[PDB]
């Protein structure tokens, strides 16, 4: 920008028929691309950078840009690189990926990749809606989620979870998902056995508090077995030689889930019209000093009217509880 | 050494108009300067090379070539957010997120033909009306949760990302908020224009489960009462009211049935002369206990502390009371 | 004539130093060598050309000129995380996800001034203390779910993303977990310092619905009992305790059987009772109030589908049923 010229000028411009070999340049015009053109970024893996800079990380397989304060970082942000995962008992997921889980075949385990930066993320989704029968297990190795370093199982059908590194203290956390319930942290197999004869109920070495039961590797519905003290009873009957396991588990809640007391449990006597303030919907039940009753059988009630109708002249100071 | 085959410019060179270059192999810094302009190549093809980049003129999406996946939006996926002008049906587009305004009324959205696994559309009830005016989501010939059947959302301030699974199971909700009960409408058993004030209607066949629409607005579940095969409306529907009754197969996702438990004290017998019974596992709610069959509520039957886990009863118990403590942990 | 107007290099060439170029049009393959560095133009201009890309100096964000959107970030959905060190209030920034530690007391976060539709911030309760020291989201004077009022998250392991939809509705939530019921605090119904340990406290006015805070922490819903205008505490709170009660408006976000016989009556000499249709688990049956449980008055096998009562009934007695799962007849 001073004295006389350092390098040869080409005022008209210049055309090339083959690749050139250029020690970099400074564009003061437009970069165009005719058809069939092709453009790459420089590979590069260095912490240090100029902001404005762009690169391809052949480590990360991920397009980064150096940023005034964040340094190097996925370009224009990071979303969900979705990918189906063929069923397989342990799979190691990698950051920035979303996994479509086919547990139709049976249960499977997924291991979170070692965390690098606060906010690293993986996504799992019940592609085929089979996690109720055949749960998924999310292992953070030694890294830990929600405190506990332990594994948790996702037991709910068609559930998706984006796990996100919070740092070391708290570890991975779900930041985003659909249809979450009681995450299950399996505690210890209280009973594992293959069955000789068409058994129905078996005795347990200890009194189970909260368990899940696996029949032939599939997990039974809370409906399929009575529980009592330290005997599990099976409705219906279990076939002969049914590989069956009972597992005690702690429950972690990541989802979000009563009765009405009439005049503080004391009545007035000679009354039968139960005008209720809290306006709700269907209500076919109410209790009376312990024993309860069912509506339109011994209790009339229409939402429109809002009040409730009793039968026998309500006894004075009567424990009156109204459901909804 | 080796006689070269290309002119060399030891101090580099300068140019004052656009050059026309059959590519080069950059070996240095490649900066720009005020009002310089960069443009990625315009490619649609599928054969690429990792670390390559481009502008998709069919997708309007900047894509890089990935070792693994191949040509994808840079940094995986994006919520292109747009308000959607209210219309009967809208076809929608991969990668975009749509804000739906059903204040006007009912409306339906068609999903894009799927190109890749993980193609994703987002929709939001930005206006809190889906309950009042259900959004239908159509997958066309392609299936959403394992069948081609359209599905309708009916939950105020829903919001949900449909992601493409594979030809097989198909479109599924990868993320979202407020997701309640998805409804896949079955045969429309009853549709008619009421000619007079009507409080009840007779149906050809009794309905297992249905949604009721009056003058194009979904009716609140409370408002309609149904018996064997007769729908009863409180209040009575006004005359010249469009009325449609549709059976639907519910599809559940957001909720995560269970809430209580079945325990017993002292095996099922009454020790006698005990007002404070201790529980073995620490529980979040013990709202009431069952004594022989009737129900005894908190601050009326007893009291309890959920760290102690010790129920404290307001009467001196007796022998063979079938004490059975409810687990309101939920 | 048909002459060229610019000099032609059939074999291409070689520079050993930075060249200064009024740009080009590439007809070939653009490539780099180890140590090579590449950058994007700087440009704040609204105007652009589809396929144009840039680094926005004020935005501090690589953008591309989209045909429809215009100059928008490449890859759209870009959630940069970062752990917000706790404070009474904190301004948050478009694009950023905040990990929130209400492990001590509560905290308050001030959603940013919006710019385009789709502007978004994500907040996340990574230590599960919202349930005890909740977060209140302030949208300044921008109006959140239809109103300008602050809302408050009480859900424990909660995550939410907020996403501007234009001023009429305003900030609304488009992704999250356990986003249950937002609380919009109203008038502070009770403000006082506990004189001494007290079992219960009489409200100045009866409360429709409220939240209770003791010594900074929010008392759990179960822990306080409310009857009309009288509130009871099990267990009773300690002496010299700071207590507050606020009426609140709940905003719903996530939104997280029955059977009988003999026409609502019975008959006589009924050993058992054939079920209407084969169903799963059969808990208990209501009879003269005191409902008797299974294996304490009756048995039933799903396959058989029959209420095998373990006795015999008499005259004038009502019976209601309860089952488990969904038999779907």
TrEMBL record, chain C:
It comes from the Viruses. This is Tailspike protein. It comes from Escherichia phage Cba120. The gene is orf213. The chain holds residues 2 to 335 of 1036 of the full protein.
